[PDB]
Write a protein that binds this ligand. Structure first.
Ligand code: ADP
Lengths: 105, 253
């Protein structure tokens, strides 16, 4: 019953806005403390790492056992599918189901 | 941990590491021969690197390329973590340099081609490596090179921008290729010195010289890779196309 719930699952934004993605690790005491973030551009399936900095920021909440990614000043080129992936403090693999972002614009 | 210890036959040790040993192993259903790396949790938590290692193993688990050591999976029990690895039968590049002192131009150019191929794949996924040392390169059945340290994002191998505490990016990987090309042809890295302080200064001021036997083609490539300004180093595509590389390499891009 341990699982990662990643929300929102689908998101539509306009150029200039912001998006926050939340990944919550439920039903376990294992810590979600090592999250790496990934994106696949529209049209592709090939996954690229996301570097934290610039328009990209991250927060972690021990109480909710969650990790969040925030992207500011959204551009059309930001559109694609985002995923959180981790090996938690119990050495177990955890992955969110994905956020499909479309930016119009 | 959908994999378990009962899934594998264990053979002889392949070597001893800082946090445990590596064993020859065989997956029972397929009879496939592999390496099983056994890490002791206590040693991990003593060097203070367990959290860092979990981030690195997660990145490694996505990398599939002929010149990157494959991670097939991982599992654990109460005291140990097990990594399921590709078996590299011919040992490290470091040991080969010990046995030969230095490499001829064919072996050097072939190794640099294989490394440039791997790093081009990594850059396509926005993955960069830290410093790359000969001890971190294993050799496969056909003598092909494999990047084996999981070092994804030791003074003699670091670029000027990093020891000067400046900004850095994928261009650090080109500096690494320059240091290794020199070390393969000459037998030692180009900024080696007696003290930490001297080495630091040599790197920062790009102070190195060539033995006279190093050919014009090799000098040209090394001099282009070891630029102080990161933005002046070539693209990986330009390395793979360099006339010294194509004249000497026994493998393609
Ligand atoms: N996948 C592998 N295939 C064959 N031999 C290996 C493999 N991994 C490690 N070895 C051998 O065992 C030794 C273990 O070293 P390593 O695992 O790199 O230790 P550490 O974790 O301290 O760096 C290596 O020097 C190498 O000779």
């Amino acid at each position: 019953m341990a699982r990662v719930d990643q929300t929102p699952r689908i998101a539509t934004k306009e150029t200039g806005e912001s998006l926050t993605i939340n990944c919550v690790l439920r039903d376990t005491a294992c810590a979600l403390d090592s999250t790496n973030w990934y994106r696949t551009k529209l049209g592709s399936t090939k996954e690229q790492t996301i570097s934290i900095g610039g328009r990209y920021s991250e927060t972690v909440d021990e109480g909710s056992n969650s990790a969040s990614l925030t992207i500011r000043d959204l551009r059309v080129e930001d559109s694609g599918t985002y995923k959180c992936k981790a090996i938690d403090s119990c050495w177990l693999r955890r992955e969110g189901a994905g956020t499909v972002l479309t930016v119009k614009g | 941990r959908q994999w378990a210890l009962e899934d594998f036959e264990i053979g002889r040790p392949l070597g001893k590491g800082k946090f445990g040993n590596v064993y020859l192993a065989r997956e029972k259903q397929s009879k496939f021969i592999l390496a099983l790396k056994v890490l002791f949790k206590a040693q991990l938590e003593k060097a203070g690197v367990e959290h860092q290692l979990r981030r690195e193993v997660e990145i490694q688990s996505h990398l599939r390329h002929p010149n990157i050591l494959r991670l097939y999976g991982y599992f654990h029990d109460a005291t140990r973590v097990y990594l399921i690895l590709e078996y590299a039968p011919l040992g490290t590049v470091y040991r080969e340099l010990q046995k030969l002192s230095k490499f001829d131009e064919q072996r050097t150019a072939t190794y640099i081609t294989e490394l440039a191929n791997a790093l081009s794949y990594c850059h396509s996924k926005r993955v960069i490596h830290r410093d790359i040392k000969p001890e971190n390169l294993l050799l496969g059945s056909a003598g092909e090179l494999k990047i084996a340290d999981f070092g994804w994002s030791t003074l003699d191998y670091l670029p000027p921008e990093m020891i000067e505490g400046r900004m850095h990016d994928e261009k650090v990987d080109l500096w690494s290729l320059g240091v290794l090309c020199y070390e393969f042809l000459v037998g030692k890295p180009p900024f080696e010195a007696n003290t930490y302080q001297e080495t630091y200064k040599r790197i920062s001021r790009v102070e190195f010289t060539f033995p006279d036997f190093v050919t014009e083609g090799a000098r040209d490539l090394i001099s282009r890779l070891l630029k102080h300004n990161p933005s002046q180093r070539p693209m990986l595509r330009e390395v793979l196309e360099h006339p010294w590389i194509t004249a000497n390499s026994s493998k393609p891009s």
